[PDB]
Amino acid sequence: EIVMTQSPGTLSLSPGERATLSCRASQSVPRNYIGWFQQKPGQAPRLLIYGASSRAAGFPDRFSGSGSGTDFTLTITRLEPEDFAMYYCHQYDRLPYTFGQGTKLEIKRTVAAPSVFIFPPSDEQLKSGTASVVCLLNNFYPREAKVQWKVDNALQSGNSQESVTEQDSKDSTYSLSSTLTLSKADYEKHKVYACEVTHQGLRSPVTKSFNRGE
Amino acid sequence: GLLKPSETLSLTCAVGSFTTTYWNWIRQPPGKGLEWIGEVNYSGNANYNPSLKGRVAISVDSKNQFSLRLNSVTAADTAIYYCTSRIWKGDGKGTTVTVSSASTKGPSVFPLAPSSKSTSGGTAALGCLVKDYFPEPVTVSWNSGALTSGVHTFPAVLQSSGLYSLSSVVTVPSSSLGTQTYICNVNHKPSNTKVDKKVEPKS
């Protein structure tokens, strides 16, 4: 089939600037059957471009597509706040039809280190036989951040789950929540619970911890 | 809407130049990219995606409609399904489909509070852990909607048990943990579960 690689994958710009998104096909696309979709969080994908160059109804002339063969491009001139979103390229020329992995167009801002907080499990939950330990990474940029759970200095793996908020509309930052899940027995069998955070805005990793039973 | 594994997914969309019209089905799994399922002309000639090794069946029927039939469904088939036409493509909306061996269950709401007392002057974080519920749609506010600034309600995660878990937090100034009360407002309509949870730290 025809795989499609989009670049940059994550594009960080500011309103007023010019955005250039690239879509490369492994083999040529003869009839230029290339489409571009725009998608905002929680919404359905809106068709932006069809036939590689034709603009769909509902979109201003700031959006334009071009290219042929194996190279295609979406250009957004004079960026507006409602332009920042996920963008997918699509080929419907040769079966099977495929999709690009997508490019995230986000608002660029200055680097901000996360504020880290740790929350022990509640006695309420501990009464049920399960313990959830939560680590909060508040208001950071860029989105890339790493969380390492340690229980009595033992690195935890495969027993935690993360989720990240969408880019904040006010300060353009991200927030992350991580949950370490243990049985009550295992939880009571240990003392020091630590969340260690690494981020490019941090001079050194930030560790927030607590002792079970204080 | 929702159905159990090993069951049959069946959808239908309404319906121009039929001889040159192609009908396509696509889907998007939660937090993932777009995926093409199948295409069909008016005669009935069929093309599908190799990943779906024949479990997919698309035909156009008399009634002005065309259908999608996915056989032997799995949790991996949980997605939002869209149907489009093509001459130039185009048809929002869509149909949310959740495949799970779980039952409808209201969430438990636990407090998220620091182990130790908060230092005055700085910022304190607090919240609610909305754990073990199904299906997805749960909503959270704070102080009946009076508190919105600094609130971060995170996307739910799907646990190995098949139940969802969500965290909602807020950061407040520390010199108000004794003058202001904080209550998370949790509503899970599928189970008719409303919970009011007051979270209180020291100081």
Residue numbers in the entry:
A (entry chain B): 1 to 214
B (entry chain A): 10 to 24, 27 to 72, 74 to 99, 107 to 110, 113 to 224
The authors write:
The trimeric spike glycoprotein (GP) on the viral surface is responsible for attachment and entry into the target cell. The stalk region of GP2 connects the globular body of GP to the viral or cell membrane and is the most C-terminal section of GP that has been visualized to high resolution. The antibody BDBV223 was identified in a human survivor of the 2007 BDBV outbreak in Uganda and targets the GP2 stalk. Here we describe two crystal structures of BDBV223: one alone, and one in complex with a synthetic peptide corresponding to its BDBV GP stalk epitope, at 2.0 and 3.7 Å resolution, respectively.
Crystals of the BDBV223-GP2 stalk complex diffracted at SSRL 12–2 to 3.7 Å resolution, and crystals of the unbound Fab fragment diffracted at APS 23-ID-D to 2.0 Å. Two Fab-peptide complexes are in the asymmetric unit of the complex, and one Fab is in the asymmetric unit of the apo-Fab structure. Although the arrangement of light chain CDRs of the BDBV223 Fab is similar in the apo- and peptide-bound structures, positions of each of the CDRs H1, H2, and H3 significantly shift upon binding the BDBV GP stalk epitope. The most prominent rearrangement upon BDBV223 Fab binding to the GP stalk peptide, however, occurs in CDR H3. The ordered portion of CDR H3 in the unbound structure adopts a different trajectory compared with the peptide-bound structure. Upon peptide binding, the loop re-orients towards the light chain by ~5.6 Å at the base (measured from the Cα of I99; the tip is only ordered in the complex) and the CDR H3 stem loses its β-strand character and becomes kinked. These structural shifts illustrate a high degree of conformational flexibility in BDBV223 HCDRs that likely influences the binding energy and pathways by which antibodies such as BDBV223 are elicited against this region.
